[PDB]
Structures are given as structure tokens and as C-alpha cells.
Amino acid sequence: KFHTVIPSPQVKCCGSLECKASSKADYTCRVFGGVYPFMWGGAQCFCDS
Amino acid sequence: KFHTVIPSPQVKCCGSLECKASSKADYTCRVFGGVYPFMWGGAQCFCDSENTQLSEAYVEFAPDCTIDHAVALKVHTAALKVGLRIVYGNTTAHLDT
Amino acid sequence: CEPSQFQCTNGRCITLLWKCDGDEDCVDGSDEKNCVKKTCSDFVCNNGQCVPSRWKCDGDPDCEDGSDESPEQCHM
Amino acid sequence: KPGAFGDIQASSLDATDIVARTDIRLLKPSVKNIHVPYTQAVSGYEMWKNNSGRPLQETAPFGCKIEVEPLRASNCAYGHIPISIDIPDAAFVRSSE
Amino acid sequence: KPGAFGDIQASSLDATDIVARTDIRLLKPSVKNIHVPYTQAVSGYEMWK
Amino acid sequence: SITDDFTLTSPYLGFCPYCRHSAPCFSPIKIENVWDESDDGSIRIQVSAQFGYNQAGTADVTKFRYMSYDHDHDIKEDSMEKIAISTSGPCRRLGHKGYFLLAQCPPGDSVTVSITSGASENSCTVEKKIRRKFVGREEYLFPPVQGKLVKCHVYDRLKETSAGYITMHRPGPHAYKSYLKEASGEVYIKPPSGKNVTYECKCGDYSTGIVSTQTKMNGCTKARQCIAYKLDQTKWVFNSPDLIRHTDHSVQGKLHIPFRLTPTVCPVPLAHTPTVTKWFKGITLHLTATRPTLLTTRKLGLRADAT
Amino acid sequence: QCPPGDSVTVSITSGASENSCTVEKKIRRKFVGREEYLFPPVQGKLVKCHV
Amino acid sequence: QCPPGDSVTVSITSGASENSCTVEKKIRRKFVGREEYLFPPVQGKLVKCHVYDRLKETSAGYITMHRPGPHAYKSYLKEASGEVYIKPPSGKNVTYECKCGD
Ligand SMILES: *[C@@H]1O[C@H](CO)[C@@H](O)[C@H](O)[C@H]1NC(C)=O
Ligand SMILES: *[C@@H]1O[C@H](CO)[C@@H](O)[C@H](O)[C@H]1NC(C)=O
Numbered sequence: 054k055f056h057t058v059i060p061s062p063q064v065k066c067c068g069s070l071e072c073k074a075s076s077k078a079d080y081t082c083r084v085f086g087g088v089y090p091f092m093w094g095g096a097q098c099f100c101d102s
Numbered sequence: 103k104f105h106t107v108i109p110s111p112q113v114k115c116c117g118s119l120e121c122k123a124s125s126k127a128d129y130t131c132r133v134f135g136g137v138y139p140f141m142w143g144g145a146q147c148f149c150d151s152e153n154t155q156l157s158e159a160y161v162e163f164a165p166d167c168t169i170d171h172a173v174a175l176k177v178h179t180a181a182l183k184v185g186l187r188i189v190y191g192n193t194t195a196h197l198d199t
Numbered sequence: 200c201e202p203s204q205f206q207c208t209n210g211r212c213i214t215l216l217w218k219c220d221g222d223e224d225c226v227d228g229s230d231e232k233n234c235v236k237k238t239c240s241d242f243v244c245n246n247g248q249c250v251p252s253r254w255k256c257d258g259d260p261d262c263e264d265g266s267d268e269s270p271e272q273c274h275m
Numbered sequence: 276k277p278g279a280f281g282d283i284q285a286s287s288l289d290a291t292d293i294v295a296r297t298d299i300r301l302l303k304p305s306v307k308n309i310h311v312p313y314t315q316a317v318s319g320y321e322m323w324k325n326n327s328g329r330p331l332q333e334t335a336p337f338g339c340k341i342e343v344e345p346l347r348a349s350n351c352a353y354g355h356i357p358i359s360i361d362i363p364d365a366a367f368v369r370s371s372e
Numbered sequence: 373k374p375g376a377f378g379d380i381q382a383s384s385l386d387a388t389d390i391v392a393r394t395d396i397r398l399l400k401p402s403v404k405n406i407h408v409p410y411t412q413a414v415s416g417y418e419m420w421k
Numbered sequence: 422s423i424t425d426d427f428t429l430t431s432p433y434l435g436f437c438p439y440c441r442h443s444a445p446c447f448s449p450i451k452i453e454n455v456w457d458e459s460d461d462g463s464i465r466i467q468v469s470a471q472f473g474y475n476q477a478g479t480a481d482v483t484k485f486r487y488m489s490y491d492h493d494h495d496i497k498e499d500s501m502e503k504i505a506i507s508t509s510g511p512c513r514r515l516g517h518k519g520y521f522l523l524a525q526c527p528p529g530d531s532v533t534v535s536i537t538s539g540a541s542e543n544s545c546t547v548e549k550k551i552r553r554k555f556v557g558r559e560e561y562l563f564p565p566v567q568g569k570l571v572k573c574h575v576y577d578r579l580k581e582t583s584a585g586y587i588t589m590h591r592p593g594p595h596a597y598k599s600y601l602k603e604a605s606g607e608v609y610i611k612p613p614s615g616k617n618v619t620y621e622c623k624c625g626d627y628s629t630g631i632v633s634t635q636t637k638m639n640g641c642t643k644a645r646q647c648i649a650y651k652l653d654q655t656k657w658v659f660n661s662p663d664l665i666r667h668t669d670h671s672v673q674g675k676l677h678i679p680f681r682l683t684p685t686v687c688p689v690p691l692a693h694t695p696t697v698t699k700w701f702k703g704i705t706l707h708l709t710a711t712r713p714t715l716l717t718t719r720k721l722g723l724r725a726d727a728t
Numbered sequence: 729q730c731p732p733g734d735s736v737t738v739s740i741t742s743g744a745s746e747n748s749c750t751v752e753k754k755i756r757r758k759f760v761g762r763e764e765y766l767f768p769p770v771q772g773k774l775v776k777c778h779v
Numbered sequence: 780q781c782p783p784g785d786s787v788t789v790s791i792t793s794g795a796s797e798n799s800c801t802v803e804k805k806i807r808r809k810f811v812g813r814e815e816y817l818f819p820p821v822q823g824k825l826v827k828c829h830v831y832d833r834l835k836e837t838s839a840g841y842i843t844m845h846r847p848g849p850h851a852y853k854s855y856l857k858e859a860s861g862e863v864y865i866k867p868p869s870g871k872n873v874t875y876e877c878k879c880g881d
């Protein structure tokens with residue numbers, strides 16, 4: 054069985070966060086440009102869209 | 103789905119309690135003559151053997167039929183409507199016909 | 200937009216679950232507009248405003264009425 | 276017909292003229308307590324829900340998207356539409372230009 | 373191939389050169405909270421078992 | 422034409438087939454109906470006891486009223502925390518109002534309501550098939566964090582909403598046995614401390630009256646031959662089949678059925694996108710799925726071979 | 729009186745002992761006569777059965 | 780040690796937290812060998828099987844632990860009539876970021 058670990062997501066606001074290749078087993082990376090994350094404590098960054 | 107509500111039965115002890123018709127959906131009314139009913143408190147009234155009980159049963163809509171219900175429809179010949187994007191020269195026309 | 204969505208003043212349509220959810224999702228706060236009265240773990244100002252419990256007796260005026268620094272509620 | 280779709284019928288959900296033909300039989304009470312022993316057919320709405328098959332949203336030919344309340348079939352093609360267009364004369368240009 | 377036996381492969385259990393082609397699709401986060409919506413094929417080890 | 426005052430409205434004793442002692446008895450809590458037509462699994466149960474109101478009828482949350490077993494019958498008052506609900510395991514309670522309650526339950530074959538850890542200590546169970554129903558075309562044990570957010574109908578947890586009404590009628594005679602006394606070859610009736618009772622009695626002839634003390638009646642011997650029930654009981658009681666109808670069965674009141682089935686938006690799972698492979702006149706879909714998932718195909722022509 | 733199940737357990741809740749014992753016994757829901765029921769009805773036929 | 784079921788729940792009960800968490804996990808009744816059983820017999824064949832060691836000193840791998848990022852509580856902000864203020868709890872220092880104009 055594989056473990057399929059998902060790392061903690063990285064967010065950059067009013068900025069671009071393209072990702073490089075990795076040597077991990079079946080490394081799938083994807084960039085999303087319209088997010089607005091919410092932890093326990095409200096919005097996680099300043100930039101609106 | 104229907105509710106099949108049962109009304110509170112009516113007993114007449116040493117008496118007769120024939121019932122008239124009703125306009126309720128699936129009104130079933132029936133008369134029984136040898137009842138000696140009880141509750142928490144013992145016998146219900148005085149008369150020993152010659153009694154009567156009026157069992158009643160009608161049908162009403164369930165409370166949740168505002169959402170969970172089916173509509174039966176008879177359809178007929180069906181008209182057709184087309185929205186057209188037609189362009190000519192450098193002019194664009196959107197029209198529903 | 201869709202009947203399952205709420206449209207704000209910015210032209211952005213959010214989900215109906217985000218309406219009156221306690222957090223502002225539209226840029227004008229229209230999702231938190233109207234709604235109902237929220238029960239207030241939180242200090243209640245005299246005019247009905249709700250503030251965090253660490254804002255009480257903080258030495259700074261936070262209520263519109265100034266109820267947080269009033270001597271009747273805050274005792275020296 | 277009891278046990279089938281259309282046990283209970285009405286013109287609307289709030290209508291007071293409701294009809295039903297379930298198989299209600301009022302049995303004779305034979306217990307100490309007051310009781311209305313009734314037996315009834317299973318709801319045909321539930322039976323039809325169990326045996327509804329598949330809706331027209333998954334069966335309709337030519338890919339007709341069936342949509343509900345102003346009931347229609349949308350975005351499907353089975354034939355040809357003759358269209359006669361009256362193009363304005365301002366759209367045309369003379370052959371010299 | 374994803375889903376079949378041999379999704380994940382390595383020379384040894386402690387090897388750092390691990391190669392896999394489990395079919396991971398990273399969906400767009402459409403919720404309030406911080407989330408990594410991912411969908412994946414089943415383990416070919418479990419399917420083979 | 423619907424009232425919610427509940428001062429003019431009272432609980433009652435019911436007869437449900439499976440008590441705490443696994444035999445049909447009379448209980449202050451009796452399930453008349455269970456409604457399970459909510460997409461989130463919440464069910465609505467009608468119980469002969471009133472919830473959220475005190476003995477006097479004032480709306481007091483976390484307190485419920487019920488008829489007592491004593492023959493000088495009154496309407497006793499108890500805490501709401503003693504009410505337990507279970508289908509196969511314990512049910513989480515979501516709402517309560519007079520005669521009605523809303524609870525989230527696991528799947529099971531019977532639904533029971535009990536008054537646990539009290540002087541009453543009674544339970545009532547009815548046969549109701551509760552199944553784990555789901556929304557959409559893919560089964561799920563729990564709703565996902567992120568999905569499609571389709572329309573689905575759930576019972577509203579707020580008790581202010583209404584989903585119809587129940588009709589409420591004046592109650593008939595109850596005819597308690599302890600209001601009789603058969604000493605020697607004569608029969609006596611003893612009303613409670615102050616309350617008037619009505620007797621109707623056919624020792625040799627039908628004679629009725631209202632008394633408030635121990636009185637002789639004719640010369641009949643057995644106490645079977647007549648009864649005594651208290652009058653002035655003008656509190657509206659639901660038309661349950663476990664009660665004798667009064668002489669006048671006009672609908673004295675209507676009361677709301679709370680927890681209206683309202684449409685909301687709820688998430689459903691989005692399955693794995695199938696890896697399609699193509700040959701000359703067809704496609705193979707690989708269709709990985711954990712829970713059961715509906716696949717529906719149809720041709721876009723005259724003959725839609727719907728599978 | 730027990731619900732149907734696949735094992736029978738006798739336990740001493742709390743106390744000094746606080747021990748349990750479970751044995752394998754296929755307890756099935758039994759019904760009298762020739763129609764299935766979870767619970768006996770209020771009114772039926774009143775047939776002979778051994779308890 | 781758990782019975783078979785469809786989900787796994789870890790909960791804090793009878794406290795200030797009073798909170799449960801349930802994750803869908805299909806727990807089957809696992810049997811060793813060529814016969815099925817609810818309970819291990821008193822006497823059998825005594826074959827080899829692999830069980831979880833109860834002592835916590837043993838290890839079956841490792842999990843990676845990283846430095847935590849920002850968490851950005853909304854209770855550190857106050858929205859005035861036309862301006863905003865940033866206040867920390869007690870004497871702690873808070874890093875603020877604002878790009879409303881720059
Ligand atoms: C349409 O526009 C093109 C270039 O924009 C022009 O050459 C042409 O003459 C126009 N046609 C008409 C019918 O106006
Ligand atoms: C529901 O339909 C299924 C067919 O999939 C059938 O086996 C089952 O008996 C039906 N249930 C009822 C209660 O009629």
C-alpha cells in the first residue's frame with residue numbers, strides 16, 4: 054500500500070507560486086489562482102482575490 | 103404517501119351508535135357490539151355486555167407532502183423554440199423565435 | 200446567479216451556506232447583512248454590539264457606547 | 276387502485292376534496308384496552324418510488340435535457356429547421372466596392 | 373499502470389528511489405477552509421489481494 | 422386559525438405495543454408517528470408527552486410535562502435531560518416542542534423514546550424502518566468536505582417553522598377505578614380531595630349525577646355496574662386512537678407540526694474521473710469507485726440505449 | 729431478555745472485580761407462528777407458545 | 780482494540796472540550812488461517828500472525844515534523860468607523876501584513 058501523504062499547502066497572496074519538479078514517488082503539483090483559505094481564526098491572508 | 107389517521111373511537115354503552123357517511127378520503131366506518139373497553143383506570147363505562155364502539159378510519163395527506171409529492175400530467179403536442187445566433191457582414195444578432 | 204447561490208453587490212455569487220455564517224465573504228459584507236440576532240464567550244455592549252472577551256477592560260474604547268471601560272461593569 | 280401509484284389523489288396539496296381507495300379493513304377489537312384494529316394496503320407512492328425505473332433525464336432520445344416546472348426538453352436535435360431571413364439592404368454593398 | 377498490482381515500486385523497502393504512477397488528480401479548492409481536494413485510484417496491492 | 426398557547430392543551434397516556442417490560446402497557450410517552458423524510462437522516466417523532474413546556478403550560482425550554490399514573494390524575498413536570506432517544510444506538514436530539522421532537526438517528530428497525538434515570542423510568546418503542554439515505558448518484562457514509570453542493574431537503578432545526586397541523590379535541594371520560602368502592606352488598610363512590618366527579622350508573626336504571634362525597638346509589642351490588650370520572654377537563658387532547666371520543670368531536674384547536682422540511686444546499690461526493698480508452702466504435706471506462714456510484718449512458722439518437 | 733447477536737457477555741460493572749466473560753452463541757430473533765414480526769402486536773390471534 | 784464497523788471516532792467526553800471526530804474507515808473482522816472465528820480458541824494450531832506491539836517504545840517508521848506557518852487570527856483586528864487597528868493579546872508580538880495600498 055502507498056501512504057499518499059499530502060503536505061501542508063503553501064499560499065502566496067498578491068503573488069505567483071509556480072512549483073518545480075520533485076523526485077518523490079508520483080509527485081503531483083498544481084497551482085490554483087483564486088483561493089481564499091480559512092483556518093480557525095478567519096482569513097489567512099490579506100489579498101482579496 | 104398518506105397518513106391513514108385513526109380518530110379517537112367513540113363508545114356508547116347500553117346504546118347504539120350507527121354512523122353516517124362522510125366526505126373524508128377513504129372513510130371507513132364500522133360498528134362493533136360486544137366491546138368492554140379499558141384504560142389506565144379500569145372499565146370505561148357501566149354497561150356489561152350490550153355495548154357499541156365506532157371504529158373510524160380515514161386518509162389524509164402526510165405533513166411532508168409539500169416537498170415529497172408527485173404531479174400527474176397529461177401532455178399534448180409540443181411547441182419548439184429556438185435561440186439563434188445569426189451573423190451577417192460584421193453584424194451579430196441574437197434572437198429567440 | 201443560480202437559485203442555490205447568493206449574489207452580492209460585487210457581481211460575485213457565493214454559496215447559500217455562506218450566508219449568515221458569521222464570516223464576511225463578500226467585499227461589502229452583504230452576506231452578513233440583515234440575518235438574525237447572534238447570541239453572545241463574548242462581551243455584550245450596551246447597544247447590542249458583541250466584542251471578543253479579551254477586549255473587555257483593555258484600556259481602549261471598543262464599544263460605540265463605550266461600555267467596555269464603564270466603571271459600572273469594569274471594576275478597578 | 277390500492278397498492279399502486281395514485282392511492283390518494285387531489286387537485287392540489289391544500290385541496291379539501293381528497294379521494295383515496297386504499298384497502299382499509301376495520302377488524303373487531305378483542306383486547307381489554309380500547310383499540311382500533313385496522314389493516315391497510317401498502318402505500319403505492321412508496322411502491323412506485325421503489326420501482327420507478329429511470330427518469331426521462333437519463334432515457335430521453337437525441338440528448339434532450341429534461342427540465343422541470345416550466346416543463347420542457349432543452350438542447351436536442353432530431354431534424355431540420357427551415358429559416359427564411361429578411362436581410363436588411365444596408366448590410367449589402369454594391370459589387371463595385 | 374494505476375489501479376493494478378505494481379502501482380508503487382522500489383528496489384527495497386528502505387530505498388529512497390521509489391517510483392509510482394498512482395493516478396492522483398488535485399481538484400480545485402471550492403470551500404472556505406484550507407483544503408487539498410485530491411482523488412486517486414485504489415491501491416493495486418489491495419485490489420490484487 | 423392555529424394557536425400555540427399550550428395552556429389549553431394537555432398531554433395524555435398512550436398505549437404502545439412494546440413498553441420497557443416488553444409487553445404493551447399504558448405510558449406517558451407514546452409514539453404516534455415517526456417521519457423520516459429528511460435527507461440528512463433527522464427524523465421527527467410524535468410523542469404523547471409535551472416537550473418544552475412546564476406543568477402550568479408556560480413555554481419553559483429544557484423541561485417537559487406528562488400525565489401521571491396516579492388515579493387522582495394530574496400533569497407532572499420533569500427535566501428534559503432524562504429524555505433519551507434511540508433507534509439502534511443513541512440518537513442525538515436536535516429539537517423539541519409540544520408533542521413533537523426532532524432527532525438524528527443511526528439506521529435501525531425500531532425507534533424508541535425513554536425517560537431514563539427517573540421515578541417514571543418508562544420506554545416506548547415502535548416499528549419504523551430507518552435506512553441510511555443519501556443525496557445524489559453516489560453513496561456516502563458522511564458528507565464530504567468538498568463536493569458538488571446540490572439541493573436537498575432537511576428538517577429545519579428551528580421550532581418556529583411549521584409543516585402542517587394536528588387537530589385537537591376536548592377529552593372524553595376516563596372513568597378511574599379508584600373512584601369506586603364495593604363494600605358488602607352495596608357500591609360506593611369516593612371522589613378525590615375536593616374535585617367534583619360525575620357518575621352515570623345503571624344499577625337498575627340509568628341515573629347520572631355530579632357528586633363530591635361518598636354517596637349511596639340505588640341498591641346494586643357489584644362495582645362493575647357503574648363508574649365515576651372527573652369533569653371540568655377542558656384541556657385539548659390529540660385525537661389518538663387510545664382515547665374515548667367525547668360526545669362533541671368538533672375540532673377545538675389546531676397546533677403546528679414543527680420542523681418543516683425546507684430545501685437547503687448540501688454537498689455530495691464527486692467520484693474519480695474515469696480513465697477512458699477508445700477503440701474504433703466504442704469506449705472503455707475504467708470507473709474506480711469505493712462506494713456504489715451510478716453510471717448512466719445513453720446514445721444521442723433516435724434509439725437511446727439507456728444503461 | 730436480549731436482542732439478537734453472535735455472542736453472550738456477562739460482566740461485573742465497576743467494583744473491585746470489574747471483569748467480563750463472553751461466549752459464542754448465535755442468538756437469533758425468533759417468531760411464533762407463520763408471519764414475521766419484530767414485536768408482538770396489540771391484538772392478534774393468541775396462539776400457544778412456550779416461554 | 781475495536782469491533783468491526785464503518786467508521787472510526789475519537790472523542791473527548793465529559794469535559795470542557797466535549798468534541799468528537801469521525802473518519803470513514805472500513806474495519807473488517809480479521810481472521811488468521813483457514814477458519815473464521817469471532818474469538819481465538821483456547822487451544823488451536825498456534826500459527827504465525829503479525830500483531831501491533833502494545834509497548835510504545837517500538838517504532839514502525841517516522842513522521843516528518845516541520846515549523847508551523849502563520850495562523851492569522853481575526854481577533855487581532857479592530858474595525859473602526861473608517862480605519863483599522865491591530866492589537867496583540869497581552870504583551871506578545873504579532874507580525875502584521877497589509878497590502879491595502881502597498
Ligand atoms: C467588416 O470589417 C472589416 C475589417 O474590420 C472590413 O474590411 C469590412 O469591410 C467590414 N464589412 C462590412 C460589411 O462592413
Ligand atoms: C425495492 O426494490 C428492490 C429492487 O431493487 C427490491 O428487491 C426490494 O424488495 C424493494 N423493496 C420494497 C420494500 O418493496
Ligand SMILES: *[C@@H]1O[C@H](CO)[C@@H](O)[C@H](O)[C@H]1NC(C)=O
Nearest residue numbers: 615616617618631632633653
Ligand atoms: C364543584 O366543586 C366546587 C368546589 O370549589 C363546589 O363549590 C361546587 O358546588 C361543585 N359543583 C357542584 C355541581 O356541586
Ligand SMILES: *[C@@H]1O[C@H](CO)[C@@H](O)[C@H](O)[C@H]1NC(C)=O
Nearest residue numbers: 867868869870871872873874
Ligand atoms: C517583543 O515583545 C517584547 C515584550 O513585550 C518587547 O520588549 C520587544 O521589543 C518585542 N520585539 C522583539 C523583536 O523582541
Ligand SMILES: [Ca+2]
Nearest residue numbers: 217222224230
Ligand atoms: Ca459569509
Ligand SMILES: [Ca+2]
Nearest residue numbers: 254259261267
Ligand atoms: Ca476594549
